[PDB]
Design an enzyme around this catalytic site. Structure first.
Site, mmCIF file in Angstrom:
data_model
loop_
_atom_site.group_PDB
_atom_site.id
_atom_site.type_symbol
_atom_site.label_atom_id
_atom_site.label_comp_id
_atom_site.label_asym_id
_atom_site.label_seq_id
_atom_site.Cartn_x
_atom_site.Cartn_y
_atom_site.Cartn_z
ATOM 1 C CB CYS A 50 40.136 48.738 36.777
ATOM 2 S SG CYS A 50 40.078 47.213 37.733
ATOM 3 C CG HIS B 86 42.059 47.093 31.697
ATOM 4 N ND1 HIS B 86 42.124 48.083 32.653
ATOM 5 C CD2 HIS B 86 41.692 45.964 32.349
ATOM 6 C CE1 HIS B 86 41.805 47.580 33.831
ATOM 7 N NE2 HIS B 86 41.537 46.295 33.674
ATOM 8 C CD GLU C 153 42.884 45.888 26.552
ATOM 9 O OE1 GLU C 153 43.432 45.392 27.558
ATOM 10 O OE2 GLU C 153 42.898 47.113 26.299
ATOM 11 C CE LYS D 233 46.188 48.781 34.369
ATOM 12 N NZ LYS D 233 45.833 49.451 33.094
ATOM 13 C CG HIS E 92 45.461 47.256 37.821
ATOM 14 N ND1 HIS E 92 45.087 48.488 37.333
ATOM 15 C CD2 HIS E 92 44.313 46.561 38.008
ATOM 16 C CE1 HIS E 92 43.772 48.543 37.226
ATOM 17 N NE2 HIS E 92 43.281 47.386 37.633
ATOM 18 C CG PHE F 267 37.815 44.249 39.509
ATOM 19 C CD1 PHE F 267 38.070 42.950 39.099
ATOM 20 C CD2 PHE F 267 38.882 45.050 39.868
ATOM 21 C CE1 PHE F 267 39.362 42.466 39.050
ATOM 22 C CE2 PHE F 267 40.177 44.573 39.820
ATOM 23 C CZ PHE F 267 40.418 43.278 39.410
#
EC number: 2.3.1.179
Lengths: 411, 411
Positions: B162, B302, B313, B334, B339, B399
């Site tokens: 990501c 994110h 976050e 997103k 994503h 990740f």
């Protein structure tokens, strides 16, 4: 201005499970190439490879934890643990933030992608392991090490096929020199000796097919070359800022003084006969270190044992060193070890560093007959002894035309 | 000291095949999430995704040439061609050497690895396409563009799941600021909406399963969140040195002024509830730009729509902005786009740049009920109008616990 030095080495290779054992095997010209036995190679054109032998990580990684990671990640951690241990770095709460990683791989978890795909084909998506993603993707070696040691600094993974190891090490140094980190674990890991890996490179006709004699197959610059030899492994180094390392009194193996990058802009797999991109990367690393080509004693070549590739590199060394061409020693350790793809640049940086420590240059074994337009000293059959060598050049020129060179200096 | 500016934008996304069309769809709150139709999703828990619709690259890439590249590479080239064209850069023999690329992907050629594995299972290794390797590996998007335009400068590919898009863009700027290149094409491309991709993330239970309403599934910070939504695409920007761009008189979209990186050192997939690594990366980018948190108008989050991730976050933005927390606008695009893994940071940098140009902030659609410990202005349902915004922050926390943040400034 911040200087970067190497304070820790670690690795797993086809000729040894440690740095020193691997080093000693290379100086004696030992081959690490064996016949594949973990899958049926009956229909395969290439039945051999440089495999990691007698691998044990039970002490480092549990059997429970082993199931969440492809072999490339397992290799990466073990070699990473070696480099951390070799370095003598204590990770404290006040340190965490300045230590990170820059570890890559060219293909990543091929073994586990095949298994999971096989499961899916015979069982549907419910048989897909829940660890599919985290066990295969390229940045998970750095993911696993960061957690393990509590590294909270920068974490990147460069995936540039054959140049991965060199790109990761150099960008770890750029990061350190910029001020983003003080210490970086850098390197690459690969384990692409799988059905898809052997077959895939086999399908492009890029692999040697000398099954009668597996240990003589990898012969860079020889007239009978018929393709590169695939190898598995992982090399890892601890890179850190000079003043930080001196202050704690670390083992200083050498200094990273130059980093050069280029692209060929020619073909996706084949290089220009000219060697133009390879020259540029050597040219750039030279300029980056601020030394001329006659100050470099030894060049660890890309030397994969491919007709087209071996000639180009040869030609590129002539263009850069010129009159020092016959004065400089260039050898391919891929004659013993094979091509480790994404770990090739990492393990070969260690060889380039060790060469400075021991003033000995590993040979290009199997070089029975140099190619017609070959004229350099390729350290032909046995290790050469050298005396006042201060600089070494490590080259990686990979698929997609992405090139890199690293320059090391004896301290 | 060398400043880096953005002089060219390009992209393919689930809500548009161009930059402006994509931009307009996002400001109107259009969803790009559809039901999957290119493979049987009968046994699958997730049957929807953000797919690239009506894709044509016949004009750019031939049908002959199309066979050597996975869809992620095809997406990457098209978006790359757009950025080159948008920039207004003439590639000359005296220029080549200073222009390169930094393009990545999180998973790479999954579609083609499945096909080739299927062939191998039913046919043996002779049915493995000769383009297996070059059509799947991560650095081939940069390999293809370099050849196409004759880019002989630095060529790298960062693969950090990501965070790929953000890491590639930032290291392209570090390269430019160091002096290794003048211009860099940077970004990411992904096309992981395949059986193994949907199944694999499905197997980890990380994906939303709201098949009754695919367009309401992606709902970051809402109480009914049940996992992220997978999307395909590619974003690409032209990064170049200030004086080089001004001298030729290029379209200057904005300036890259800050880049921060960190690691969580916690879990391979889950983040710390604290949001500690996310804070550090924002903290580092801030320090790198030399501005306080109250100078940043908008944060492209994110925000993947995961219970654990969305809270972390949120908590990390409270910690960094503090009293400006309620003053700063934070939205997740997103919610419309899904994503895009390795392209997520690239497309979202463009959104962050465009927001500065048009003084409009895209919404977090589907936010019907904020989570219990949520208190920030998440630009809830419609685009917000802003007036004197000069800085934007783009976040990617991926990740393996690898984090990154980019800061852009209006010029």
């Amino acid at each position: 201005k911040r200087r970067v030095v190497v304070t820790g080495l670690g690795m797993l290779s086809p000729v040894g499970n440690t740095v020193e054992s691997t080093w000693k095997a290379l100086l004696a010209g030992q081959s690490g190439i064996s016949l594949i036995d973990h899958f049926d190679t009956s229909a395969y054109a290439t039945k051999f490879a440089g495999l990691v032998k007698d691998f044990n990580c039970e002490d480092i990684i549990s059997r429970k934890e082993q199931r969440k990671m492809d072999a490339f990640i397992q290799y990466g951690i073990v070699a990473g643990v070696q480099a951390m241990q070799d370095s003598g770095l204590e990770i404290t709460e006040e340190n965490a933030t300045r230590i990170g990683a820059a570890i890559g791989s060219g293909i990543g978890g091929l073994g586990l992608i095949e298994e999971n795909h096989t499961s899916l084909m015979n069982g549907g998506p419910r048989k897909i392991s829940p660890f599919f993603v985290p066990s295969t993707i390229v940045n998970m070696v750095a993911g696993h090490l960061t957690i393990m040691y509590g590294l909270r600094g920068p974490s990147i993974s460069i995936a540039t096929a054959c140049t991965s190891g060199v790109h990761n090490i150099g960008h770890a140094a750029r990061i350190i020199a910029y001020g983003d980190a003080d210490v970086m674990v850098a390197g690459g890991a690969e384990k692409a000796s799988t059905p898809l890996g052997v077959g895939g490179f086999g399908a492009a006709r890029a692999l040697s097919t000398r099954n009668d004699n597996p240990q003589a197959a990898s012969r860079p610059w020889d007239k009978e070359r018929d393709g590169f030899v695939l190898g598995d492994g992982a090399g890892m180094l601890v890179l850190e800022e000079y003043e930080h390392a001196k202050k704690r009194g670390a083992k200083i193996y050498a200094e990273l003084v130059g980093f050069g990058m280029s692209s060929d802009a020619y073909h996706m797999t084949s290089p220009p006969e000219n060697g133009a991109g390879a020259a540029l990367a050597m040219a750039n690393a030279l300029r980056d270190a601020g030394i001329e080509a006659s100050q470099i004693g030894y060049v660890n070549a890309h030397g994969t044992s491919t007709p087209a590739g071996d000639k180009a590199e040869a030609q590129a060394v002539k263009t850069i060193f010129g009159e020092a061409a016959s004065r400089v020693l260039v050898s391919s350790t891929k004659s013993m070890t094979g091509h480790l793809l994404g770990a090739a640049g990492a393990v070969e940086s260690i060889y380039s560093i060790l060469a400075l420590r021991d003033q000995a240059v590993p040979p290009t074994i199997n070089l029975d007959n140099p190619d017609e337009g070959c004229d350099l000293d390729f350290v032909p059959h046995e290790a050469r002894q050298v005396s006042g060598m201060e600089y070494t050049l490590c080259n990686s020129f990979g698929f997609g035309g992405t090139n890199g060179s690293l320059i090391f200096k004896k301290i």
